[model samples]
Target: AREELRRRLRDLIEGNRVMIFSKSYCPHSTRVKELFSSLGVVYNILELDQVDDGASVQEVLTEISNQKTVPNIFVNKVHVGGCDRTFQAHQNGLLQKLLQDD
Candidate 1:
């Protein structure tokens, strides 16, 4: 069961150029949307709180990303980390670099 779920997560992460793992009630997670809106970019978001295997997904994410929080961000099949780091990436121009790699 865990293997299947992990595979599912991989396909999702690699398939979407930008994938954001979030929770519905997380204010930071919600705010990321507005952040992206300002940049005029496209991304894919999976509201973990709404998925049937959300808890399992988070587990796999922790195993994969070493992060235990929501708003886990991935870009071009690479891990970009949470909101603050993502913002920092934007600050230093790393964000645009990731998008341009693909």
Candidate 2:
């Protein structure tokens, strides 16, 4: 089950430069998703709440993100923090560069 989930996660991120780890009901998550939509970039939204026992989310947060927080954003496999950092990245045009990459 773990391996299968990991494979799915890989598929979610594969060829996609941006991935957002968020909870369904989180306001911050909603805002971040809106920001991505405004930017016209297609990103994968992984809701931790959807995963059983949250093992998959926990693994990504602890190992890949090094932070246990919702709205954890990733651009090209790089951890980009939650809503605040994502908003800041958008303001500074960092997200544009990230979205333009190969």
Q: By summed lDDT, which 10 consecutive residues of candidate 2 come out lowest?
A: 61-70
- Candidate 1, residue 100: Cα displacement in angstroms equals 3.4
lDDT of 1 by residue, 1-102 (tens): 889988988888778777777776766765655555455578776787898988897777656645445666677877776557678877778876765663
- What are the Cα lDDT values of the candidates? 0.70, 0.66
lDDT, residue 98, candidate 1: 69
List the pairs of residues colliding in candidate 2: none
In model 1, which range of ten residues has the least summed lDDT?
Answer: 62-71
Q: Per-residue CA lDDT of candidate 2, range 1-102, in tens?
A: 667765666565655678766665556665776687788788776677776747665565445544444555667766566556778878888876776672
lDDT, model 1, position 54: 82
Clashes of each: 0, 0
